[PDB]
């Protein structure tokens, strides 16, 4: 289950990264000063957003752009924490074997 949800989180994260990159460009174009207006760097922004690396070179300036951003943040946070939860359940189970329980 934990391994499945982890893999499910990864494939969902990828989808969100792709869709989020596409939706960002669509939302940002039309607003003067926006830098998130091309797909290649938008995808790079999506990775930055999901990981929270905080380079701060690219960010949305519109309402819907920021809404897309939030979805990517939470998706990244949920995913990277589901993996942590999956790794924990793995270690907990292995500990319950090296003690014979």
């Amino acid at each position, epitope marked *: 289950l934990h391994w499945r949800a982890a893999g499910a989180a990864t494939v969902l994260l990828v989808i969100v990264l792709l869709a989020g990159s596409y939706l960002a460009v669509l939302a940002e174009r039309g607003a003067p000063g926006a830098q998130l207006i*091309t797909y290649p760097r938008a995808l790079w922004w999506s990775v930055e957003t999901a990981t929270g690396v905080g380079y701060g070179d690219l960010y949305p300036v519109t309402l819907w752009g920021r809404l897309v951003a939030v979805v990517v943040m939470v998706a990244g946070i949920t995913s990277f924490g589901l993996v942590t939860a999956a790794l924990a359940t793995w270690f907990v189970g292995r500990e319950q074997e090296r003690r014979g329980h």
Partner: antibody
Amino acid sequence: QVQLQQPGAELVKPGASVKLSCKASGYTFTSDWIHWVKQRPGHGLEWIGEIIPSYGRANYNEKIQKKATLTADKSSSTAFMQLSSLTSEDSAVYYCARERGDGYFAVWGAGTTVTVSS
Amino acid sequence: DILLTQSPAILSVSPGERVSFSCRASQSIGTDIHWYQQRTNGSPRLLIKYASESISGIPSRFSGSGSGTDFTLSINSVESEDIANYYCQQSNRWPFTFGSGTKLEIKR
């Protein structure tokens, strides 16, 4: 093969309107944006607006008077530009261009020479 | 909006020499600049994308350099077919904008 096909010329009466077309061919992606550029005789290039056919979303130049309205037909792969209430100031060559969503205009149309007179 | 200044407006060069077109942005745009060529009665044609990247079908004597706010289009050994107008265009911030344009002129 020619990727963007525009009619050679369009004669318009002052006050009337015209709907320019831009039939496309070649590779087609959802990331494709169709742009329109205005060039008056002896002048430079002027970005009018853009549109993404796979959504119908359109953006326009805010620094100029809005004379244009962008639409597209996904089936016939044709982009449309509605110019309304035209004066002599609107007489120019109108280009259409294709952008892969990476910032540059790879291919241009031959351009439509729009003349506004009676 | 990003302002692109192309000075001078006209360049007079002798056949075989190396010419350089200038494009200055009103603010830092990295390398998000693109160069186009337009001959008489012709449509614009992409020469250089992203400041220095080459385009297929374009003669190798065309090159580009620069970053930030200062960009240069260079033609190595100018010949008669290079006589045209040259425009730069940025894609860093919305909306996209063009330079005023620079005309190449050959003194034969």
